[PDB]
Design a protein around this ligand. Structure first.
Ligand SMILES: CCCCCCCCCCCCCCCCCC(=O)OC[C@H](COP(=O)([O-])OCC(O)COP(=O)([O-])OC[C@@H](COC(=O)CCCCCCCCCCCCCCCCC)OC(=O)CCCCCCCCCCCCCCCCC)OC(=O)CCCCCCCCCCCCCCCCC
Ligand SMILES: CCCCCCCCCCCCCCCCCC(=O)OC[C@H](COP(=O)([O-])OCC(O)COP(=O)([O-])OC[C@@H](COC(=O)CCCCCCCCCCCCCCCCC)OC(=O)CCCCCCCCCCCCCCCCC)OC(=O)CCCCCCCCCCCCCCCCC
Ligand SMILES: CCCCCCCCCCCCCCCCCC(=O)O[C@@H](COC(=O)CCCCCCCCCCCCCCC)COP(=O)(O)OC[C@H](O)CO
Ligand SMILES: CCCCCCCCCCCCCCCCCC(=O)O[C@@H](COC(=O)CCCCCCCCCCCCCCC)COP(=O)(O)OC[C@H](O)CO
Ligand SMILES: CCCCCCCCCCCCCCCCCCCC(=O)O[C@H](COC(=O)CCCCCCCCCCCCCC)COP(=O)(O)OCCN
Ligand SMILES: CCCCCCCCCCCCCCCCCCCC(=O)O[C@H](COC(=O)CCCCCCCCCCCCCC)COP(=O)(O)OCCN
Ligand SMILES: CCCCCCCCCCCCCCCCCCCC(=O)O[C@H](COC(=O)CCCCCCCCCCCCCC)COP(=O)(O)OCCN
Ligand SMILES: CCCCCCCCCCCCCCCCCCCC(=O)O[C@H](COC(=O)CCCCCCCCCCCCCC)COP(=O)(O)OCCN
Ligand SMILES: CCCCCCCCCCCCCCCCCC(=O)OC[C@H](COP(=O)(O)O)OC(=O)CCCCCCCCCCCCCCCCC
Ligand SMILES: CCCCCCCCCCCCCCCCCC(=O)OC[C@H](COP(=O)(O)O)OC(=O)CCCCCCCCCCCCCCCCC
Ligand SMILES: CCCCCCCCCCCC(=O)SCCNC(=O)CCNC(=O)[C@H](O)C(C)(C)COP(=O)(O)O
Lengths: 88, 30, 56, 64, 50, 107, 85, 125, 546, 82, 117, 45
């Protein structure tokens, strides 16, 4: 394997970009790392709640609520997942 | 399993801990 | 709520109606079947001329 | 604090004042406990009372 | 009548209905045909004709 | 590294490489993922000692078993025990030690 | 139980002691119980086919006793007035 | 999977409550009360008043049928008498207070056998 | 062969926990444990055929006298009669398969040989319990399985909830152990001996049967004592299988069947209330192991009612114990395999399909589930129908309500067992981990228990199988209809809108929460009074300042 | 490892996971694998359980269609009493 | 009603936590995930019918009623992933912390290893 | 679970159907009479 309990940056980036594109309003070409959920992508707060719950499902995590409040962009999600030792 | 099977050699040599915290000094008897 | 994809008959209205029908019938058989069985057991011998010829 | 973003932080505190129970609640629950866990004592006391009242009836109706 | 609002969950999790992830009805009752055939052979051997 | 660390056993091939467990502690049962080098020989020798104990307790059990009633047929304890009484069947008839009806009512 | 009196016992005390019949099975079908126990405890796995007659006869005797017990109950209730005659 | 991460519990950095030994701090996060549900929120946010209120009906709903059959129904409901025995077999079988043969209302000593099956507690002298 | 069924699992435990195991390791200790159980099972098979079929009981004076002061005489003596042979066959046969399973299930545990030694000690103390001929060696077995249950429930000691579950099991059983000890005092005082063959009671002083019943209600987890049983799921899956099949929970029922000194009203009411309560409890759980735990509690209620019915009922009670152990151990082993195939998840909302398990695990769950729900001409059909038909002809009016409670319980059991199969395999997949287990040792462990399920049909437990208690076709075939009703309801997956009843039942009637403050917090507060107000206060004598 | 492989982001399937042995559905590939010991032991034990059920049901079919009462009453009336 | 933590939140995060906990409680009360999907869609449509509000009193009344509903329908047996807090696999076999060792303690200062008096 | 009105209607229909079956069970002939008539019917074959 690789890493001291943490997943690599590239595969986490690929999986987060896969999860993010599952909206009707989203144009796929705008989905990139370090892209804002509201300003750049055009998702409201309920869409962000659903996206973080889907990322919880994707990486097998129970993300604490204060941490899920802080996630506001693709790069924030990638940086959070790469700091989880329990992320599978 | 080490060696690819249940019926291989073991993989530990030496003290598996120290009984009563006693460590041999220069190989001398206690 | 959709049924499982390999068992779509379990979500059918007829199947749910039949399950309710059988369950309700068995639940009330639970309460009725004891004195009816006891009366049947008594009537096995009561109408026997070998035991009680007065009752035929 | 290296795992607080994984399992939660220490900010939320326990809401309990570590105070004793109220006096009436303690008395009532203790009396219920005495009645439940010491029921042979009450059974045997009732046996002694039922036995001595019968001997009272015998001694009353016998000397008349 | 809108229901595709707020993170399409069916499309994201459409892999749950993989044919190798479903209940398999070919091997749902293993050996029951063999036991039934042996029972029929026993009945024809013992009870019907003798 | 400490001076006494060279005398210690390594973490075995059963133990995950990222698991840490303080190898200096002497556990009476063996400890974390115990896998000694000569374990197959030790297993054979302990099986031999267990077989010795098995024979000893089989002999003690056979010497101290008391049967207050005769059995109703042949039992496998007749083969190794001489204190087993002769079988007496369900009708009260005395039987042979091999569990067959004696002559006069057999065949 | 005078109208439906018990049948004679066909098994003696010594016969029930020899078969080690449990004391709550020492009723008016004890001889059939002895036959059934003797057949089943020595027949091994295939007891249902080669001890079918002994089990059937034991259950038939218990059926006769069951019918007598129903008749005794009917006569007792008739004497108490609980069932009109 | 041995060696999974687990969060540690902080040490006290403030004055302790007088009755602090009602919290179980084993070293890892989170600790627990000494007995579960003694304090803190109960599962499902239920309370003691909830359970006592539902039980004040549900307990008599379960004790109702036993009382009715033990006080308003007797041995004569059965369509048959108990299993019949010879006198030498029966006379020891009905010595047990435990036995179901004392419900034989066709026995000549039915009352006396029932009067001998009364449970006592203190053995008299 | 007779002493080899009792000594030799204790020998396996002694080997695997001592410093001999430092030379064997995991690999050698697994061999030692499996062989030490195979020998004891072979000995128990010989004992079973000699005592049950050929009727020759054997009494062994093992280690002389234990203690003898005045007329209180306790000896180290065994007696192997019909009940003892039944129990030894059942315990050793289940524990052999559980050892074969545990040598593969706990392979990645760091202290595997310690776990195997604890399992062997637990089995050996159960054998000592059933092989004893007097009450005091029975108490050795009783407290030995209690201690080993504490060691095995709280095995993962770094988890606080497991430690508290083990402490809870100890304390709940300690109440009933106290009552059982007082009952032993009553029995010895008013009969003069401790040996079972001299304890023939026709009419005793009421406290005897009541206190022995309370002591049995503790171990068999009846009403107001069931609270420890559900929390004992903190331990690993082999511990749960051995607790719920052969050891521990069957000990109180064995004691009541052996002694037969109860008063039937308490026994019938406790058993039927327990059966209905555990039936409704298991219908509203989503933890896969907790449903099986509550089904164990429900079947123990059935056996309690049966031994209330009479001597024939006592035989039927022992028969249901014997057939229950096999399919209950099989159910727990199959559930452990399903849990391991789904990444450790125990919630039945995250299962589905036929990819996370072997074909044999699904077959094992199906066959043991069919035996549990009383499917015709399987193992549980004979014993459960015998108890139900014996309860339908009892002349006690109390048994009328008990029979109705048992029939409702039968429908509930066929509901939640079918729900356990339906959620696990029939619905669409809703987990995310597929690692199916197909090792040889757990598959053979399951196959052995399925062979015992077949054996109970082919060779009965006692002579009751095939005896006809004469009932009409309506009374006789109603439990089959109740089984079908449970199956149809559970496959329809229907639910009710009465959410307050759902949350009252799913929270298990609030017994734990009410016990958290009706005795427990008052005990703590009375301790505060006795220390602070008494020792430091009213009785304290101060100093004289000068 | 895990029994299914996932793709993500519209990537091509890796070439080792393609052919007549693998099934891909909505971006997830699984392998059609046959296990011999599991299949043989399950079929043998299942056939034993099926025969055990069916044989004992056949031996008691008349007492299961009718009840105890009817079957033994017909036996008494047709084939004598004692 | 919400806890003292949720009552301290900003309004946007308060509504977000209410929607998130509603989705999780719908998971807890459902039999499967495939049962959960249309209930999740219905809960989303329920929040969309109050998006265009401006009156803070009506917003407060709807928010407080929904928080009362979530306090009522808190499941007694929540679904937790096993390796997290409240899960079944949390805190089982952690790696040992470093514990210090003292070699040959009995041999250090022999004849003087008791308690003083 | 599934909240089904077909199941709820089936529950009451089943209660009614088995009440009618119980009424039919109460007014049935004795098993002695049923067996005797069944044996008389078989004896003309
Ligand atoms: C066990 C599980 C525990 C938790 C579930 C609670 C179930 C309780 C219940 O009554 O559910 C019925 C429940 C009906 O509730 P509902 O569908 O929400 O309400 C009816 C409809 O609104 C509208 O339905 P409807 O009006 O068409 O009629 C349906 C209902 C009558 O509905 C009414 O209108 C209620 C009026 C009451 C008298 C009629 O019929 C009955 O219940 C009659 C008896 C059968 O049945 C189900 O649909 C669930 C079936 C699951 C199994 C239950 C079968 C009975 C089990 C018997 C043993 C009881 C064990 C519980 C012990 C209590 C502690
Ligand atoms: C003449 C006495 C000389 C021998 C004892 C001595 O040297 O005491 C010095 C020492 C003087 O200490 P202090 O700093 O002046 O404090 C006086 C008490 O703490 C006073 O504190 P307090 O306000 O709690 O005293 C009221 C006292 C109520 O006082 C009494 O009960 C006095 C009746 C004593 C007559 C005997 C009957 O109640 C109790 O302390 C508990 C009930 C005593 C039983 O007395 C005590 O330690 C208390 C004496 C209480 C006697 C009962 C001990 C219970 C065991
Ligand atoms: C008299 C008793 C004397 C001792 C008897 C007990 C010893 C037999 C069990 C040996 C230890 C079990 C663990 C073991 O051998 O593990 C292997 C399991 O071995 C088996 O095949 C099963 C064990 C033998 C069969 C079961 C014997 C137990 C006795 C009960 C039999 C009842 C029928 C692992 O798989 P493998 O080595 O076959 O495959 C290697 C792997 O694929 C590559 O790394
Ligand atoms: C030989 C005696 C047993 C040696 C085992 C010692 C041991 O393992 O020490 C433990 C100390 O813990 C104890 O106190 C255990 C005491 C064991 C008691 C031995 C007796 C076992 C049988 C019980 C019968 C007792 C008599 C019953 C009377 C009725 C600490 O465990 P660990 O760190 O090695 O592994 C812990 C792991 O997570 C699983 O727990
Ligand atoms: C005068 C004699 C009084 C007799 C009764 C005294 C009972 C005293 C109990 C003291 C408990 C102190 C230790 C303690 O809190 O341990 C808990 C045991 O709970 C428990 O012990 C809870 C159960 C208490 C039931 C007591 C009565 C049972 C029989 C009913 C009659 C831990 O366990 P935990 O509760 O946190 O479990 C968590 C797993 N989930
Ligand atoms: C921390 C807790 C650990 C728990 C440990 C397990 C649980 C133990 C519970 C019960 C403990 C009882 C131990 C008693 C020890 C010996 C007491 C008897 C002393 C003595 O001289 O008796 C003679 C010794 O015989 C013999 O001893 C037999 C002779 C040798 C042949 C068999 C050898 C023993 C093999 C055992 C294998 C492993 C078993 C493990 C228990 C027997 O004669 P008597 O004078 O009593 O006369 C009467 C019959 N003749
Ligand atoms: C559709 C839902 C109906 C529910 C009832 C189950 C089917 C029974 C059909 C029926 O009417 O059978 C009666 C059974 O009633 C009775 O006399 C028995 C009442 C209790 C039976 C409950 C269990 C049914 C089996 C599953 C008549 O019986 P028959 O005249 O056909 O009977 C003698 C031949 N064997
Ligand atoms: C139903 C009711 C039943 C009642 C049953 C009652 C049972 C008795 C209970 C108590 C029995 C034990 C009595 C002695 C307890 C002593 C407690 C500690 C005392 C202590 O620490 O001693 C010194 C202080 O107190 C002192 O100086 C203590 C002096 C000795 C106390 C007793 C003698 C008092 C004088 C005798 C005459 C009493 C009057 C008779 C009418 C220390 O002092 P230090 O050396 O540190 O300080 C010197 C600088 N000044
Ligand atoms: C505070 C608690 C401590 C004190 C306990 C009660 C006081 C007892 C002493 C006074 C009476 C002595 C009676 C002497 C005698 O032989 O007369 C019998 C006397 C004789 O009858 P006679 O010959 O017809 O006059 O009466 C009886 O046989 C029945 C009376 C029983 C004894 C008094 C009542 C005690 C009830 C139990 C204690 C209360 C428990 C509290 C907790 C309840 C559960 C939560
Ligand atoms: C362990 C369960 C005991 C319960 C037994 C219930 C009665 C069993 C006899 C009835 C089944 C008769 C089967 C007739 C032929 C159908 C095809 C078959 O069994 O082989 C395919 C196959 C088994 O083939 P095998 O594994 O080669 O024996 O059966 C199935 O997959 C299920 C279809 C048969 C059973 C459902 C009706
Ligand atoms: C078991 C089921 C329990 C039921 C749970 C409760 C269900 C009730 C739900 C209905 C109650 C409500 O809508 S609660 C009232 C919610 N409506 C408002 O607050 C007015 C809108 N104001 C805003 O600031 C934003 O749009 C905001 C939406 C907050 C954020 O979205 P964005 O940042 O993108 O903008």
């Amino acid at each position: 394997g690789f890493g001291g309990g943490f997943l690599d940056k590239d595969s986490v980036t690929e999986r987060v970009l896969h999860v993010t594109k599952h909206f009707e309003k989203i144009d796929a070409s705008k989905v990139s790392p370090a892209a804002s959920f509201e300003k750049d992508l055009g998702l409201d707060s309920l869409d962000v709640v659903e996206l973080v719950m889907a990322l919880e499902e994707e990486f097998g995590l129970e993300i604490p609520d204060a941490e899920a409040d802080k996630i506001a962009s693709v790069g924030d999600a990638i940086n959070y997942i790469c700091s989880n030792p329990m992320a599978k | 399993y080490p060696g690819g099977s249940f019926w291989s050699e073991g993989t530990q040599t030496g003290k598996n801990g120290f009984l009563f915290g006693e460590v041999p000094i220069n190989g001398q008897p206690r | 709520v959709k049924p499982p994809r390999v068992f779509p008959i379990l979500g059918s209205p007829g199947y749910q109606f039949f399950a309710g029908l059988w369950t309700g019938a068995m639940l009330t058989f639970i309460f009725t079947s004891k004195p009816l069985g006891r009366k049947e057991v008594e009537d096995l011998v009561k109408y026997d001329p070998a035991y009680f010829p007065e009752y035929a | 604090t290296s795992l607080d973003h994984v399992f939660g932080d220490n900010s939320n505190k326990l809401n309990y004042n570590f105070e004793p129970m109220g006096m009436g609640s303690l008395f009532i629950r203790t009396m219920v406990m005495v009645g439940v866990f010491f029921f042979p004592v009450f059974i045997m006391i009732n046996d002694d009372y039922k036995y001595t009242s019968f001997l009272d009836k015998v001694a009353a109706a016998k000397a008349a | 009548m809108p229901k595709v609002v707020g993170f399409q969950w069916e499309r994201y999790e459409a892999w749950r209905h993989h044919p190798l992830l479903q209940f398999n009805k070919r091997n749902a009752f293993p050996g029951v045909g063999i036991g039934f055939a042996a029972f029929l052979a026993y009945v024809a051997y013992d009870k019907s004709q003798p | 590294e400490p001076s006494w660390a060279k005398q210690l056993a390594p973490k075995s091939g059963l133990c995950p490489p990222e698991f840490h467990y303080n190898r200096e502690i002497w556990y009476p049962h063996g400890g974390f993922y115990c896998d000694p080098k000569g374990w197959r020989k030790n297993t054979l020798l302990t099986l031999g000692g267990i077989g010795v104990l098995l024979y000893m307790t089989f002999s003690y059990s056979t010497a101290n078993e008391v049967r207050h009633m005769p059995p109703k047929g042949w039992i496998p304890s007749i083969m190794w025990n001489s204190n087993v009484p002769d079988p007496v069947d369900f009708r009260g008839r005395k039987l042979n030690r091999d569990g067959t009806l004696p002559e006069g009512e057999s065949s | 139980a005078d109208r439906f009196p018990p049948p004679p016992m066909k098994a003696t005390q010594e016969q029930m002691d020899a078969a080690d019949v449990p004391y709550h099975y020492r009723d008016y079908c004890a001889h059939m119980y002895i036959d059934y126990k003797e057949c089943r405890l020595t027949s091994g796995f295939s007891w249902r086919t080669k001890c079918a007659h002994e089990l059937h006869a034991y259950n038939k005797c218990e059926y006769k006793e069951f019918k007598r017990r129903v008749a005794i109950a009917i006569e007792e209730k008739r004497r108490r007035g609980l069932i009109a005659a | 999977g041995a060696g999974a991460p687990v969060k540690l519990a902080p040490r006290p950095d403030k004055p302790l409550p007088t009755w602090y030994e009602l919290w179980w701090d084993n070293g890892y996060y989170p600790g627990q009360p000494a007995a579960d549900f003694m304090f803190g929120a109960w599962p499902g946010n239920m309370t003691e008043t909830y359970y006592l209120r539902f039980w004040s009906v549900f307990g008599l709903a379960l004790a109702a049928p036993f009382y009715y059959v033990a006080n308003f129904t007797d041995e004569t409901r059965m369509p048959m008498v108990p299993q019949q025995y010879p006198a030498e077999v029966r006379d020891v079988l009905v010595q047990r207070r435990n036995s179901m043969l004392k419900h034989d209302f066709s026995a000549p000593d039915f009352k006396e056998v029932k009067d001998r099956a009364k449970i006592y507690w203190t053995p008299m002298y | 062969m007779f002493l080899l069924s009792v000594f030799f699992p204790l020998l396996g435990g002694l080997v695997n926990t001592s410093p001999i195991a430092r030379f064997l390791g995991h690999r050698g200790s697994s061999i030692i444990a499996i062989g030490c159980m195979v020998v004891a099972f072979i000995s128990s098979v010989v004992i079973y055929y000699e005592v049950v079929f050929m009727g020759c009981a054997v009494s062994v004076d093992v280690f002389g006298t234990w203690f003898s002061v005045g007329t209180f005489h306790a000896g180290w003596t065994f007696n192997f009669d019909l009940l003892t042979a039944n129990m030894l066959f059942t315990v050793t046969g289940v524990s052999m398969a559980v050892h074969m399973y545990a040598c593969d299930y706990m392979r990645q545990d760091p202290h595997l040989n310690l776990f195997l030694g604890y399992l062997s000690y637990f089995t050996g103390f159960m054998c000592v319990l059933v092989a004893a001929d007097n009450l005091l060696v029975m108490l050795v077995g009783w407290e030995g399985i209690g201690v080993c249950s504490y060691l095995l429930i709280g095995y993962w000691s770094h988890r606080l909830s497991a430690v508290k579950s083990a402490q809870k099991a100890i304390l709940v059983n300690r109440v009933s152990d106290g009552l059982l000890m007082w009952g032993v005092l009553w029995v010895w005082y008013h009969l003069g001996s401790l040996e079972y063959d001299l304890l023939n009671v026709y009419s005793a002083s009421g406290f005897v049967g009541l206190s022995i019943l309370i002591g049995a209600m503790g171990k068999s987890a009846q009403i107001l004592f069931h609270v420890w049983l559900a929390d004992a799921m903190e331990g690993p899956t082999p511990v749960s299988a051995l607790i719920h099949a052969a050891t521990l929970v069957t000990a109180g029922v064995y004691l009541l069947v052996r002694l037969h000194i109860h008063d039937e009203m308490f026994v019938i009411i406790v058993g039927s209330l327990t059966a209905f309560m555990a039936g409704v409890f298991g219908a509203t759980q989503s933890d896969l192991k907790r449903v099986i735990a509550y089904s164990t509690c429900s079947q123990l209620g059935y056996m309690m009612v049966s031994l209330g019915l009479g001597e024939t009922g006592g035989e039927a009670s022992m028969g249901h114990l014997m057939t229950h152990a096999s399919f209950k151990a099989a159910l727990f082993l199959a559930a452990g395999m399903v849990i391991s195939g789904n990444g450790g998840n125990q919630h039945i909302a995250r299962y589905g399909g036929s990819a996370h398990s072997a074909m044999f695990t699904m077959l094992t769950l199906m066959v043991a589930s069919l035996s549990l729900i009383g499917w015709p001409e399987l193992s549980g059909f004979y014993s459960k129908e015998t108890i139900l038909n014996l309860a339908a002809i009892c002349a006690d009016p109390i048994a009328d309500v008990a029979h109705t409670l048992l029939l409702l319980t039968a429908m509930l059991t066929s509901a939640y067992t079918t729900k356990l199969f339906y959620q696990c395999f029939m619905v669409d997949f809703s987990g995310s981990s597929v690692t199916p287990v197909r090792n040889v040792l757990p598959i053979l462990a399951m196959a052995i228990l399925l062979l015992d399920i077949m054996l109970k049909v082919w060779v009965g437990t006692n002579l009751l199988s095939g005896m006809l208690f004469f009932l009409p076709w309506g009374v006789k075939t109603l439990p089959f209809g109740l089984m079908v009703a449970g199956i149809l309801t559970a496959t329809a997956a229907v639910g009710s809108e009465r959410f307050t009843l759902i949350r009252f039942c799913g929270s298990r009637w609030g017994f734990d929460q009410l016990f958290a403050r009706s005795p427990v917090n008052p005990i703590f507060d009375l301790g505060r009074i006795t220390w602070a107000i008494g020792d430091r206060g009213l009785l304290s004598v101060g100093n004289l300042r000068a | 490892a895990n029994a299914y492989h996932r793709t993500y982001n519209g990537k091509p399937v890796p070439p080792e996971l393609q052919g007549a042995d693998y099934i891909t559905y909505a971006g997830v590939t699984m392998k059609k694998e046959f296990h011999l010991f599991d299949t043989v032991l399950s079929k043998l034990i299942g056939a034993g359980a099926t025969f055990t059920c069916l044989y004992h049901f056949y031996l008691n079919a008349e007492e299961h269609w009718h009840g105890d009462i009817y079957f033994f009453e017909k036996d008494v009336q047709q084939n004598g009493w004692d | 009603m919400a806890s003292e933590v949720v009552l301290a939140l900003p309004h946007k995060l308060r509504v977000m936590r209410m929607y998130r906990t509603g989705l999780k409680e719908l998971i807890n009360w459902s039999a499967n995930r495939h049962e959960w999907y249309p209930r999740a869609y219905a809960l989303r449509q329920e929040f969309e019918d109050s998006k265009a509000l401006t009156d803070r009193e009506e917003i407060r009344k709807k928010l407080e009623h929904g928080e009362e509903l979530l306090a009522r329908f808190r499941h007694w047996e929540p679904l937790i992933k096993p390796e997290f807090v409240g899960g079944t696999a949390y805190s089982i076999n952690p790696a040992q912390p470093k514990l210090k060792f003292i070699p040959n303690y009995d041999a250090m200062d022999e004849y003087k290893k008791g308690d003083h008096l | 679970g599934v909240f089904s009105r077909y199941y709820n209607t089936g529950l009451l229909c089943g209660v009614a159907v088995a009440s009618g079956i119980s009424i039919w069970w109460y007014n049935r002939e004795s098993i002695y009479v049923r067996v005797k008539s069944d044996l008389e019917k078989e004896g003309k074959t």
